[model samples]
Target: SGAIYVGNYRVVNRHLATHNDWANLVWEDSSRDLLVSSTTAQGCDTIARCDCQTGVYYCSSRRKHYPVSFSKPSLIFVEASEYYPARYQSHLMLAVGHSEPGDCGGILRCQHGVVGIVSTGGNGLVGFADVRDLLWLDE
Candidate 1:
């Protein structure tokens, strides 16, 4: 259900510049919500939702972002038993960087709002819940 990516045309550099160092746009289809996650472009894992009608925004995380490491990859541990050797912990991580326009990727859209796969999680696909949780921007 989270196998969707949306455009981020609404996320202007000026708007984000005033808020934090780095930020990215994201959208959830089922909820018809357009959210802005993270404060620094490639920093915390905070999330927020936009009010299409009122134009007001709400930050979801207790703080602006979550306590996460930006320098290192976002690691997600997986069990490696039946699929591989027993000794393998399968600690996986994802590396994200800058991207140009007109690239092939995923987008989350609803109504008229959209969010792009600015920096996906361990996998390229931004899951519905993860996008609502992890997706962040890159400076």
Candidate 2:
């Protein structure tokens, strides 16, 4: 399940599939890139604006997938690292980070909760599915 939790952040637990999926790909591991979903109550109910600037987390990483621990609509300032897509697209945003092969489905959080789902990645940055723009053909 995508609901794995750590400290201030949680993982995307369900799959709200859509065709606009930015980069839904499988990894070497058995984990599915279920690149569209929401998290628990403490997580974000809405998403960050596409115009959202680089934001920080409350307690977070530079790994493949990690939720930015945050405060409110505005991202946090602690473990919170500035998370901005060097690039963005169809319900997807590419982060400037590194991955460990099968590091997919990492949840992105804002003060509202979760914003995106980590999907595709390798040695360099990663591309995560934006929850806000995920076009649900079958919710």
Candidate 3:
């Protein structure tokens, strides 16, 4: 089963692709055990909505105020990409520049944790989504 648990939120073998033909490997559903085991193996950590705390998450269970710190890389490809026909991409507040082929959707990992979810791989640089806009603030 390609179902993996992002903290018990069993995500099925689902793959999401954008309008630009950006995609990833197919994970089958029968890999649930294999998939879920993958995460539980690493993150023996707490899970929370982790926003500004006004909207804390609860399974009827959890609490936290500590923030995680991740390293910021130097090379932003110097100048990143902008103006995809998807308009929203322009508003995404790019985390880095454009990238290599097939680089879209790859997990951009920093030393301690995740950095970005790559979006585009052309335009001579890589474009990524900033996590701050997400954990997207009280907008």
Candidate 4:
């Protein structure tokens, strides 16, 4: 079997955890949302939501547990990367997208070497807002 590639790196190999690496890349479009995490993986089995407008990331592993929030310096085109050497094959990365008034929030599946947002609907790539709007959303 071959390694599972996330973005440009091999994340999984032979159902074993080898390395934990994560990288959050910026997207040119606002509607393009990337995968935050997955339960199938050894790590990052929780669900997280980021409101780029506020630079706040909320995560929750269990429904009974209250969501935790972590504030960042800035969310605009910010790249969050984390690697866990202690944990085999455990990596976490997320590309947070700026949300607007009419924008819907949802994660898209990986395709064509990238993940897309399906909230906007139609071909997975449509209605991209300007970078200025990304800043405006923060305001």
Candidate 5:
């Protein structure tokens, strides 16, 4: 239920169709670039790399190297209030670019549903049901 932090961001697990499961998390560096989580919903388990500056993402899984492009930078947000009770209590929104081909993005929620604490991926593939613990590096 916890996420491992690579740098400023953390990594979490995402489930896709019960056939495959991979990592889907965000990576943000105020002094560097922005990154959005990628998934294997359409294909196999792959590693996603993004160039936030150019809005280009590359997925290399099963020797399938493909690139997807977006229009702008990711729009990030967090819902602090209890507007969506049944939903994630408190979650971070990583909207990596808004185009097509590669809209690689998802949400990370806290297990306790706190207002500001980052949590793990919720239940279901879309992470909209149960709550799981989050794992991340201790800075």
Candidate 6:
């Protein structure tokens, strides 16, 4: 059976009832891209795709949510050495905080010497320990 056409007045009314924030959708290229945010100590909130050729960042309107946390501004390098005592010596971690998080974005706090990591030994540790004692160990 065929029906008669009316109008989309009710449908249009439902669409207009919803409110959206465009600022939360649209953002600066420098403000919320993975390349700039990852390298510059600020984390990007918007979804983005990287252009490896020109070293430029482009943003996508699609919103993505992740469990992003604040990380330190510097990269920490760990080195291990062979010791005379075999069982006791494993890995040596050297942590250096060269920079701090940006003012406008979320920050990774390093208070109370709380560095995190996942254990290679699979002991269910998120990362490694933050040693604040080595700075004064030799003296």
| Most accurate candidate by lDDT | 2
lDDT of 1 at 136: 42
Q: Residues 7-64, candidate 1, lDDT per residue (tens digit)? A: 3222322111223323343322212122343322232222333322111111121112
Per-residue C-alpha lDDT of model 4 across residues 81-119, encoded as one tens digit per residue: 231112211112223333322332222222111121212
Please identify model 2 stretches exceeding 4 Å from their true place: 1-50, 55-89, 134-139
* lDDT of every model, 2 decimals: 0.25, 0.38, 0.28, 0.23, 0.25, 0.18
Candidate 3 Cα deviation (angstroms), residue 6? 4.2
Stretches of candidate 6 above 4 Å error?
A: 1-86, 89-109, 112-119, 126-129, 136-139
Q: Report the lDDT of model 4 for residue 36.
A: 26
Model 4 local distance difference test score: 0.23
Candidates 3 and 6, the one with greater lDDT: 3
Q: For residue 2, what is the lDDT in candidate 4?
A: 15
How many pairs of residues collide in model 4? 0
Model 5 clash number: 14
Tell me how far the alpha carbon of residue 31 in candidate 1 is from the true structure, in angstroms, after superposition: 24
- lDDT for each residue of candidate 2 in 1-139, tens digit (9 for 90 to 100): 1333322233342233333232432111112223332323343234444444344321113433343332122211112112322332233455556553234455565554455555545555555544443323112
Instruction: Please give the distance, in angstroms, between residue 16's alpha carbon in candidate 3 and its true position after superposition.
Output: 3.3
Quote each prediction's TM-score.
0.17, 0.41, 0.34, 0.16, 0.21, 0.17
* Best of the two (2, 4) by lDDT: 2
Ranking by lDDT: 2, 3, 1, 5, 4, 6
Question: Once model 3 is optimally superposed onto the true structure by TM-score, how far is the C-alpha of residue 41 displaced, in angstroms?
Answer: 10
TM-score winner among the candidates?
Answer: 2
